[PDB]
A paper describes a structure:
Linear poly­ketide intermediates undergo a terminal intramolecular cyclization reaction to produce the final cyclic polyketide product.
Additionally, each monomer of MdBIS3 contained electron density consistent with 1,3-butanediol, the cryoprotectant. Despite the use of reducing agents in all buffers and crystallization solutions, the electron-density maps indicated that the active-site cysteines of the MdBIS3 crystals were oxidized to their sulfinic acid derivatives (–SO2H). Differences in the side-chain torsion angles of Tyr260 in MdBIS3 (χ1 = 61°) and Tyr269 in HaBPS (χ1 = 50°) compared with Phe265 of CHS (χ1 = 170°) significantly reorient the tyrosine side chains and increase the conformational flexibility of the nearby Leu262 in MdBIS3 and Leu271 in HaBPS. Replacement of Thr197 in CHS with Phe in MdBIS3 (Phe192) appears to be responsible for closing off access to the coumaroyl-binding region of CHS.
Residue numbers in the entry:
A (entry chain B): 10 to 387
B (entry chain A): 10 to 388
Amino acid sequence: QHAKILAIGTANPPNVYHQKDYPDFLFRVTKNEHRTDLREKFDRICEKSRTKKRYLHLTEEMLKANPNIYTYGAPSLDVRQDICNIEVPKLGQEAALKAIKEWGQPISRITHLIFCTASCVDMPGCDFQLIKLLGLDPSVTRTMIYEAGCYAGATVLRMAKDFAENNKGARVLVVCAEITTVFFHGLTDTHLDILVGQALFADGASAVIVGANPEPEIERPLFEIVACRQTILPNSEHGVVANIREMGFNYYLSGDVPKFVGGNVVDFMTKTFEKVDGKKKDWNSLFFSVHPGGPAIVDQVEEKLGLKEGKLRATRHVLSEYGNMGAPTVHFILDEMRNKSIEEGKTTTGEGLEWGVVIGIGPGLTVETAVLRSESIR
Amino acid sequence: QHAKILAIGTANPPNVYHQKDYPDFLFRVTKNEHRTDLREKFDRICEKSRTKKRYLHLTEEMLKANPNIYTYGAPSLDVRQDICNIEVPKLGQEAALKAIKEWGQPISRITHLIFCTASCVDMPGCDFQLIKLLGLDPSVTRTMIYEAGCYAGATVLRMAKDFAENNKGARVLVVCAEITTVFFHGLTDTHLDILVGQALFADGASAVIVGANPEPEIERPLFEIVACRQTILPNSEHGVVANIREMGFNYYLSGDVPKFVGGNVVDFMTKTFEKVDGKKKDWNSLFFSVHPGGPAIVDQVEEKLGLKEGKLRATRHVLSEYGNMGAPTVHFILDEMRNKSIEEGKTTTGEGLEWGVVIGIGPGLTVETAVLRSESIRC
């Protein structure tokens, strides 16, 4: 009786930024139009980003009111936090209400809450704020995951699995929400990593309901969370770093991250599936939700696992339409996969296949995998 | 087959600050000797603190090198983080090695790590840093609890319970570490709450190993984690607030926190024990580890539960000898209880008693309780 995903909901800020327009926007609003060298570099990155549009909370008016946000290294944490500590739970609320609607049970039936964000930090936390917004039972059992990073969309499923399976009748609401206002920085030739985040990072929230022993003909499972594994990729501590500073949340990204992922994916996939089955897996027999940290990560997984054309379609679709929203992204991909599977008349939520995986990738480098089974559409 | 606590280790920074000397120290090193008004207030708080000494990482030399740390509201997060992001995992390491020694198994048997701190935040986190320091398996399953606050010593036991019980053979290392350098602020009559934290807050780390199905040739359980409950006390959102700011981690403490705890303790105890056997009265039958957020919280629990003299001795001992170290404190109290029980020749690690409770109290106000059973002390 494994934990099942019973519902998925998602949300994004209302303002859409088409990638074709973003270089002009960024260089104009940050007063960097004279930096033709940086503009060339940014254009090259955007052209390769495989991201067509992103939703962002941040607006030009907010930048005009708080120019410290685009003045590289200036003190600005306080204004960023004042925004994100409000906007993160609000965006999470929107996703949560959608998940709860799908699930079809009363809010009072939720026994556990996991809230995850890398975009803010406060005491009481986002979990407390969401309890207030939703009217959750004040005795919900909470887990508040702050500043984990891009592997956490898999991690929260692992945590939810344990809580749901060890507590009879438990129903876990999992909310991941990101507002990248805290990570926005201006442009300097001494910190080119910012050009990558400026091209890729985006805002969004997901919500998932998890429970074991779904009520027959009442709850409708989408996926089963079978087994999970977390690991640190050797010799990659510099891959993704983010520091909480007076200037906001600063970050560094190694150009070697894709190669590290590609160099470890056979191993981490093999060791993950060893927890479920003693037989060797055919990687093409699986469905995939891969955290699209950037386009090259997706390509590395495809290449090293020998995946056929189109296997990573759902992943690429979300990267294209939403960008890298951090931890929620893999949940957007599962939702997209389920929806496309309905559209195509597939037999299961996992593209007609039985077994699949969620791959989260973030600081360490850390990879967390969750092995899933699909569920029947009918 | 419930999860058991198999070991507890603790650590503190080396420098001891006796409470009798602390007002003179604080007012001297922060250049506030002219604030005789604030000194009077601080003396009264220290007199009532029931804290005799504390261990602190922060030194006078660090303050001299970084005077923004004592300049109220000045930018100082970066220097605080540069200290705490290093010192928190290091202090945790010290506690963890002690727990691991008691536990008696190789480090390779650790499958899960929970790291908890309210003193810093970074990516990768303290959990990653501790893995490196200890040489844990790179595939340990991690939970990194940042900025929860003072309920979390109970919360991490709840989390460890579920991880240990749902993953057969799992062994969970739980490390809670606090370095209050990030919370140190200077003195202003516009923010008197700082006088309370200056009197009470302290540094320390705990490490606990949790596992179900103890290995009889090696492992020796101390307590069993039976059932847990987390709740928000009504109408108390202003009780404890802490914000992560350019000036460091700022905090506000309502004078009404003890009254909220006292007003709710019978209810939260009753609802917790509803998960076990329906206990509704006669609270003296239990042993207790109560987070000593301040002296008045301890006194309110004692009064409202009708506890007899000496029931909260272990709690009061840790408050006296260590202060309020945040989440680790309740683990120090369990360790003290176990050690006093050995000294006195009690039949169990819980002062001879069978059932007990850990009470964590922090922002929300949030209370997390963990119902424990003790274990036998061999002959």
